Design a protein around this ligand. Structure first.
Ligand code: SF4
Ligand code: SF4
Ligand code: FES
Ligand SMILES: [Zn+2]
Lengths: 112, 93, 105, 687, 73, 181
């Protein structure tokens, strides 16, 4: 229930990472019915989205940073489930459902 | 005779060096001893001597279509710097 | 995320030229170079869509260069440090206003 | 304790230091410092009105009074020399009450017009009244009043506010070098003025606005436009010339409101020229905002960036490589010039240079086109020899340093060139190169004075670099330099004064005109802000592309117009005449659909089929590191590593043509100033 | 009518404040100096302004635009 | 029971390692403790016979970006028994969790939720720690000095989606900062 103490070491922190991954990913069928995503995106694509967010932070070595990231992850998850703000092609922070990149930016504006 | 043909082989020569660092000492002696003769035999060739406070000694040549070749001049003696220039002039030009 | 990769400048604002008092120097600020503003076409008011349009001058201040530098790298902002220019105190004399021109040459 | 404003103190010798006490605390100051300066070292801010660190001491406002032990009277700290064992008290009841009394006298006749006075919000008198003399007013008689005076279109006058500090009078006689302002009359009815009707014609006249502590002398074009608290301050540099004066750009929204000097002891010393201060008006006028290709009826039509770039790229491949020519403008940044040179070189062309007299010069050795003595080092010269240069109109802040040295050190000035008006005494030695032969062969009163000078200084204008006999002239100049021992390991007195902000970086990067007639045989011309080139030499059938933010004649000839950002709207690299490299800082957004200059060239190169190895400005600067590494080592002072000995011997015969004048109109020098209402007014009356 | 007034005044039925203040003739003063308060009751006017009348041209109060001239010389 | 007695009595009776700084002033007596001793010190003040600090008035954070521990957590406390007030403070950074005092003072619950919402400071053993003031799904902690006044997003009704939606901000007139310094 309560906010746990900071994880002592990386084994403790990574153990907490897997519980968050399990809890966040287990709630995909609830999210699918809440946002009516049956004809929009497959459950696996949102599972791979969560895994990708976790992998993008695999380089963090401070257990206290990991604890804060998990806590913010639980809060992001809770707001998505409990108080849904349904857009069309996003949930929360994540989008759902011959020239280099300089000319495209150049044609758009002067601020890159 | 190649020292009279740098105008016909490359469009521009650049020598980068440090004003005081010992690593740039051979390059400075090379500039102080050879620039007078090189410019005299190649009056229409820009030989740009650009000194900076913390750069490794370098040499650059600019041929056709802005194609460029560079040589690291660190750990070289002054006759070897003269040799590296002759390779730049005679090859790739 | 997207706002964390902007380039900033860490700098100490110089003294103004319209006042001889020096009681604002020593401060260090992070310039967010927010230079995207335009005119609203109903009144001509200055419109902007940059969240960091005024935070760098209003609220974000640092008492030292090191403090400003450490905060930028913790936030991920790529910064450049501009050292401030300082005056050179030179010897002045009221007596110099009456210096002898010397023997008529 | 930290000195006030972080002021640096330099000691000639530790033995030449004395000890003083400021409010008990102990400080070590050089011999000759005044009591006020010792207070500054001790981190104590003494109020002052008439004292200015760059002007002679006056001691008339009496606001700097402090208590000195064993002294019967309060001491004017700005004027009194500090002595060993001196005990200085700045917050005792005598000092506090003396300040209160003087402040009451200052406000006695001062007009009640803070709401209509532009100094409000940045006024020393308001602040020192708040802090020191917090005395309720008890003056109930009639105030004096003064009529206003006309000093020209730049300086607005409200003389009721004047507190007779005489800073403006002393500036006119010690810095500006033009004695027009004086103090007329006697008593409380003394008035600052010119007596006869006349306008301030000095190019440094706008600095009296900064030094006037009250709203008596204010900027006329800025009048009533804004309050200081609503202005955003940007710390940048000036591009009006090759001096790189440090400035502060004040803006409100997407508009520059005013430009004021910024402290830089080595360059401009908190002064700027009138062109630098009053050219900001042209930044919002006649701006190129959209890409534009001329239509069938020979009239321009706005298009997108894609359509405009395709038109230029499509036609660049229908011309021979040797017929491609690119000219960089006088306001071009180092990044844009490097990309221009890279693009032109990969299009098989070798014709890229910077507009101006120094277009086809020998840039091999950096000494040959830089002020090697340095602006701050000019103060150590006991003799100036100016050859073919008018510094007063070419580099005003450099000329200011020379005047300052002549008044203080009694240095002598020899001038060779067309007749010109100098703001300091100077012997006119001649107008053409025959004097250089005359100087070289000796037998002249100035020839022996040059030989008798300990640290001589020769300054040669860049306007003598487009002459037919530049080599012969520079050969003669070096012979005079070597003969008189002008260049030594302890003193480098040979200088070359460039005229354009872009020239120093262009020569470092390699932008040298090879073919003297490459323009008259061009089929593709890329004008990167080069509005000052003569465009009649371009063949009538040659594709011309103009990229810039303004334009008068090149816009008329261009087939395609590419709008570009100005120096107040981007981060660019600029090098001044002394090899000092600095960077601008963006202050306001760009106007219309304009783009940064290097972005247009990099974008146009990809459209033309050339791949450059950079996408961001950081890639361009790393590329510049391979060419001119000093261009990316910003804000670093570096001595020259090689000298005139490496120059080949030259045997050309000198011509007889007298030297010409480079800058005909000081106020109309670039495309920004030519789009300025104020610079137009100055050319009408101030010239 | 001027460019300054045209920025905000889109109604041409009435005269602008600039033309209205130009119509009131200069006030003649016996002496070289006059104090203007902008109102008969000073507390309801503008901050007191002292105006020198040494010039031949009418002298303008910088707050309210009233003009003053020397009566005799 | 004036501020002189509390300052002198606390110095004699408190464990020495608990307090790093003690200030007596007319602006309020103030003990600066280390993070690991905050809970025990507050329990001592509440239970001890000669202090009886029974009421937790509020908990607030202060941001000091120039400090390596930018946040300062201030506890304002009142003793109705002795008619006296005491201030206890501690420092924290963006990742250091600190002890919750809900078990000592139930009123701390919402105030600790506000500190987390406004500053991002987390509280060990807090029973229900979530945002309390900001909109659901809010990113950032607005009372931090670096957080912009107008934030990052704004809301409006979007007819095609038939709902209220969040978009990045676009101001008709930007907030004008007036520098009077
Ligand atoms: S100079 Fe202007 S702002 Fe300063 S006290 Fe006088 S009227 Fe007021
Ligand atoms: S006009 Fe200004 S600078 Fe000149 S004497 Fe009066 S107060 Fe001083
Ligand atoms: S500052 Fe010394 S008398 Fe004016
Ligand atoms: Zn009036």
């Amino acid at each position: 229930i309560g906010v746990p103490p900071n994880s002592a070491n990386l084994t403790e922190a990574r153990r907490r990472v897997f519980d968050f991954f399990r809890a966040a990913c287990r709630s995909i069928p609830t999210i699918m019915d809440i946002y009516n995503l049956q004809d929009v995106v497959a459950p696996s694509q949102l599972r791979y989205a969560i895994s990708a967010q976790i992998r993008n932070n695999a380089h963090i070595t401070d257990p206290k940073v990991i604890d804060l990231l998990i806590f913010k992850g639980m809060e992001e998850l809770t707001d998505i489930v409990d108080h849904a703000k349904q857009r069309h092609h996003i949930i929360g922070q994540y989008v759902v459902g011959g020239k280099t990149d300089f000319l495209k930016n150049f044609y758009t504006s002067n601020y890159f | 005779a190649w020292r009279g043909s740098i105008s016909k082989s490359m469009k521009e020569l650049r020598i980068l060096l440090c004003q005081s660092s010992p690593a740039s000492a051979p390059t400075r002696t090379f500039v102080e001893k050879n620039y007078k003769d090189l410019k005299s035999l190649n009056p229409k060739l820009p030989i740009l001597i650009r000194e900076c406070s913390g750069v490794q000694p370098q040499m650059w040549a600019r041929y056709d279509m802005g194609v460029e070749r560079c040589v690291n001049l660190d750990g070289l003696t002054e006759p070897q710097i003269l040799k590296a220039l002759e390779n730049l002039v005679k090859s790739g030009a | 995320e997207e706002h964390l990769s902007r380039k900033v400048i860490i700098y100490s604002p110089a003294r103004t030229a319209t006042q001889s008092g020096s009681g604002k120097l020593g401060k260090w600020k992070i310039n967010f170079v927010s230079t995207l503003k335009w005119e609203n076409p109903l009144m001509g008011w200055t419109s902007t869509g940059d969240p960091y349009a005024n935070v760098g001058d209003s609220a974000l201040a640092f008492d030292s260069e090191e403090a400003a530098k450490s905060f930028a790298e913790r936030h991920g902002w790529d910064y450049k440090v501009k050292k401030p220019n300082t005056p050179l105190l030179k010897v002045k004399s009221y007596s110099d206003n009456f210096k002898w021109k010397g023997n008529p040459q | 304790r930290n000195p006030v404003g972080g002021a640096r103190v330099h000691f000639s010798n530790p033995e030449d230091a004395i000890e003083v006490f400021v409010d008990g605390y102990a400080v070590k100051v050089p011999k000759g410092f005044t009591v006020l300066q010792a207070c500054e070292v001790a981190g104590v801010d003494i109020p002052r009105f008439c004292y200015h660190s760059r002007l002679s001491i006056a001691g008339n406002c009496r606001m700097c009074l402090v208590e000195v032990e064993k002294s019967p009277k309060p001491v004017a700290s700005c004027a009194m020399p500090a002595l060993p064992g001196m005990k200085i008290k700045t917050d005792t009841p005598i000092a506090k009450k003396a300040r209160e009394g003087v402040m009451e006298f200052l406000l006695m006749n001062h007009p009640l017009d803070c709401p209509i006075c532009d100094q409000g919000g940045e006024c020393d008198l308001q602040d020192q009244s708040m802090a020191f003399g917090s005395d309720r007013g008890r003056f109930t008689e009639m105030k004096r009043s003064v009529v206003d005076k006309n000093l020209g279109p730049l300086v607005k006058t409200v003389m009721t506010r004047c507190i007779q500090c005489t800073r403006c009078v002393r500036f006119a006689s010690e810095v500006a070098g033009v004695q027009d302002l004086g103090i007329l009359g006697r008593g409380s009815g003394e008035e600052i003025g010119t007596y006869v009707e006349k306008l301030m014609t000095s190019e440094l006249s706008g600095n009296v606005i900064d030094i006037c502590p009250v709203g008596a002398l204010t900027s006329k074009p800025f009048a009533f436009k804004a309050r200081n608290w609503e202005l955003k301050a940007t710390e940048t540099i000036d591009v009006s010339d090759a001096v790189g004066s440090n400035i502060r750009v004040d803006s409100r929204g997407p508009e520059v409101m005013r430009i004021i000097p910024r402290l830089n002891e080595d360059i401009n010393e908190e002064w700027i020229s009138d062109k630098t201060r009053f050219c900001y008006d042209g930044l919002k006028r006649q701006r190129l905002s959209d890409p534009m290709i001329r239509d069938s009826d020979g009239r321009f039509k706005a298009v997108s960036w894609r359509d405009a770039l395709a038109v230029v790229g499509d036609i660049i491949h229908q011309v021979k490589p040797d017929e491609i020519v690119g000219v960089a403008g006088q306001l071009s940044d180092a990044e844009s010039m490097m990309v221009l040179k890279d693009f032109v070189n990969r299009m098989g062309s070798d014709n890229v240079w910077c507009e101006g007299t120094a277009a086809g010069v020998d840039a091999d050795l950096r000494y040959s086109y830089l002020m090697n003595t340095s602006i701050s080092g000019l103060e150590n010269a006991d003799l100036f020899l100016l050859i073919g240069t008018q510094p007063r109109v070419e580099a005003a802040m450099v000329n200011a340093r020379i005047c300052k040295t002549v008044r203080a050190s009694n240095a002598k000035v020899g001038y060779v060139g067309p007749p010109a008006e100098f703001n300091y005494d100077c012997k006119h030695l001649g107008t053409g190169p025959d004097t250089l032969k005359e100087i070289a062969e000796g037998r002249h009163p100035f020839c022996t004075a040059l030989k008798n000078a300990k640290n001589p200084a020769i300054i040669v204008g860049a306007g003598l670099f487009n002459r037919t006999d530049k080599n012969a002239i520079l050969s003669s100049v070096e012979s005079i330099a070597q003969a008189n021992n002008v260049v030594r390991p302890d003193w480098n007195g040979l200088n070359f004064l460039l005229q354009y902000a872009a020239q120093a970086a262009a020569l470092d990067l390699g932008l040298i005109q090879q073919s003297a007639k490459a323009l008259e045989s061009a089929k593709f011309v890329y004008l990167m802000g080069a509005d000052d080139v003569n465009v009649d030499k371009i063949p009538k059938d040659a594709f011309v592309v103009y990229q810039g933010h303004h334009g008068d004649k090149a816009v008329y000839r261009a087939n395609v117009i590419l709008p570009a950002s100005a120096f107040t709207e981007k981060e660019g690299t600029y090098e001044n005449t002394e090899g000092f490299t600095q960077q601008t800082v963006p202050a306001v957004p760009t106007v219309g659909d304009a783009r940064d200059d290097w972005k247009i060239v990099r974008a146009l190169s990809e459209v033309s089929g050339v791949k450059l190895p950079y996408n961001s400005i950081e890639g361009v600067r790393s590329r510049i590191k391979s060419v001119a590494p000093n261009l990316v080592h910003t804000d670093e002072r570096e001595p020259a590593a090689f000298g005139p000995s490496l120059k080949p011997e030259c045997k050309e015969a000198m011509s007889t043509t007298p030297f010409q004048t480079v800058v005909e109109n000081f106020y109309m020098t670039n495309s920004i100033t030519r789009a300025s209402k104020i610079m137009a007014q100055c050319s009408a009356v101030l010239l | 009518v001027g460019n300054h007034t045209a920025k905000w005044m889109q109604d041409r039925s009435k005269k602008s404040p600039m033309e209205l203040i130009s119509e009131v003739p200069p006030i003649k003063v016996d002496g070289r100096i006059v104090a203007c308060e902008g109102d008969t009751n000073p507390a309801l006017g503008h901050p007191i302004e002292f105006i020198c009348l040494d010039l031949n041209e009418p002298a303008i109060c910088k707050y309210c635009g009233l003009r003053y001239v020397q009566d005799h010389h | 029971m004036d501020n002189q007695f509390i300052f002198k009595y606390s110095w004699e009776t408190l464990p020495k390692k608990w307090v790093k700084k003690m200030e007596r002033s007319e602006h309020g007596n103030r003990f600066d403790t280390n993070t690991d001793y905050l809970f025990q010190l507050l329990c001592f003040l509440k239970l001890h016979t000669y202090t009886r600090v029974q009421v937790l008035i509020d908990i607030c954070g202060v941001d000091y970006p120039s400090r390596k521990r930018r946040f300062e957590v201030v506890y304002n406390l009142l003793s109705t028994r002795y008619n006296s007030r005491i201030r206890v403070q501690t420092s924290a950074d963006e990742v250091t969790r600190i002890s919750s005092v809900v078990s000592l003072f139930p009123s701390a619950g919402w105030w600790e939720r506000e500190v987390w919402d406004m500053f991002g400071v987390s509280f060990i053993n807090h029973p229900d720690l979530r945002r309390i003031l900001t909109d659901y799904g809010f990113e950032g902690h607005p009372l931090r000095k670096d957080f912009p006044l107008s934030g990052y997003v704004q809301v409006r009704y979007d007819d095609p989606e038939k709902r209220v939606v969040s978009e990045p901000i676009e101001m008709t007139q930007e907030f004008r900062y007036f520098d009077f310094a």
